[PDB]
Amino acid sequence: LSTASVLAFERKLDPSDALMSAGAWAQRDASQEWPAVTVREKSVRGTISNRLKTKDRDPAKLDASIQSPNLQTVDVANLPSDADTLKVRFTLRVLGGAGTPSACNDAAYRDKLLQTVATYVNEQGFAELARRYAHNLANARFLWRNRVGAEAVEVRINHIRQGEVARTWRFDALAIGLRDFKADAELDALAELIASGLSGSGHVLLEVVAFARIGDGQEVFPSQELILDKGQKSKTLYSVRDAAAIHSQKIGNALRTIDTWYPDEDGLGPIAVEPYGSVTSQGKAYRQPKQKLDFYTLLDNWVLRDEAPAVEQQHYVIANLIRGGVFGE
């Protein structure tokens, strides 16, 4: 029994592109004809603020660089000057059947993996992972920079069973912190819904609408595209039919920020679950493969050598299975 050459998992927890719109606070219950936040252009003039390479540190060359500055065109998105509340809306889809790979080579390997994740579900349910996912939906972690320094954030989550709303949740996203995981009756009811979606015992579709009270005319932060060349424009923002938007993978990276079991520390907070679970903002790999706590060595110990790791690392490897990916040689 060895690991297969190919192994692929399609993702559960499918989000949509989060669209932005704007309005006034206390009109948020009538926030259906709220106008879309548009992306405009403006001109910026740069200054010299980089570190110099000790050869451009001569005063004449520095002053000559101050003489001729660069001019750029930059995409920008703001709230309207009469609106103070940003509305960000997306849909999440929880499917279930997380253990079954969409591609596999060895039949013994996939059957061993299936009974491994089957015993994982039988030992305990999805309640820990779905509780942490309901926490990351409760606080507005999917408002990445739009949440930083907000006055009041409020999340409305709607379970949509048929073509209408089956159930509603109303969260104060600043009360639910970003650091720890609490216990709440409405949050655990939402967690039970997400767990029943994850266990294959139901098809879960949610509509998540977050309202951030930022201020009149303040800048919002949609997702940012990629520029390969210029000749002019130096920053592009993501947009879906003339409305500022956040990428679906940005929302998905904010959803699975649940990993509190990395070997480095625990006072930093949760990170996103990844193989060699890493953050690009810090440029450093937590869960290095030299330590015995990355995803691949844990999976090869649990499935091949039958070494069941600790139950929080079991939560980590099953969260990586829910994330999906391309595993193999």
Question: What tokens appear for 141 in the block?
Answer: 């972690």
Binding mask 251-270 for its own copies (x = CB under 8 A): --------------------
Distance CA 266, CA 100 (A): 31
Subset of 123-152 contacting its own copies (CB under 8 A): 145, 148-149, 151
Closest separation in Å from C-beta 174 to its own copies: 10
Give min distance, CB of 217 to its own copies, in A: 4
Q: Note whether 114 binds its own copies by CB under 8 A.
A: no
Task: Report the distance separating Cα 243 and Cα 224, nearest Å.
Answer: 13
Considering the complex, what minimum distance in angstroms separates the CB of residue 24 from its own copies? 8
* Position 29, amino acid: D
Q: Check binding of 235 to its own copies (CB under 8 A).
A: no
CB of residue 183 vs its own copies: minimum separation in angstroms?
27
Q: Which two tokens stand for residue 242?
A: 């003339």
* # of chain residues touching its own copies (CB under 8 A): 89
- Selected from 44, 108, 175, 311, the binder of its own copies by CB under 8 A is 44
Pick from 258, 251, 248, 264: nearest CA to 319: 258
The H or E element that residue 90 is part of is strand 85-94
**What is the end-to-end Cα distance of the chain in Å, rounded?**
15
Among the candidate windows 64-72, 116-124, 165-173, 307-315, which touches its own copies by CB under 8 A?
64-72
Min. distance of Cβ 82 from its own copies in angstroms?
A: 10
Give every CB contact of residue 54 below 8 A, 6+ residues apart in sequence: none
| Residue 284: CB minimum distance to its own copies, A | 6
Q: Which residue number, 45 or 170, has a Cβ lying nearer to its own copies?
A: 45
Question: Given phi > 0 = left and psi -120 to 50 = alpha, else beta, which region is 140?
Answer: beta
Q: For the chain, how many residues are written?
A: 329
Chain breaks in the chain following residues, C–N > 2.5 Å: 231
Which helix (H) or strand (E) segment holds residue 155: the answer is: strand 152-159
* Cα 45 to chain centroid, rounded: 33
Closer CB to its own copies, 167 or 203, in the complex: 203
Site for its own copies in 69-108 (CB under 8 A): 69, 71-73, 78, 81, 84, 89-91, 93, 95-96, 102-105, 107
Contact string (CB under 8 A) for its own copies, positions 171-210, x = contact: --------------------------------x-x-x---
Binding track, positions 265-304, relative to its own copies; x by CB under 8 A: ---------xxx-xxxxxxxx--xxx-----x--------
Pairing of strands 85-94, 14-15: antiparallel
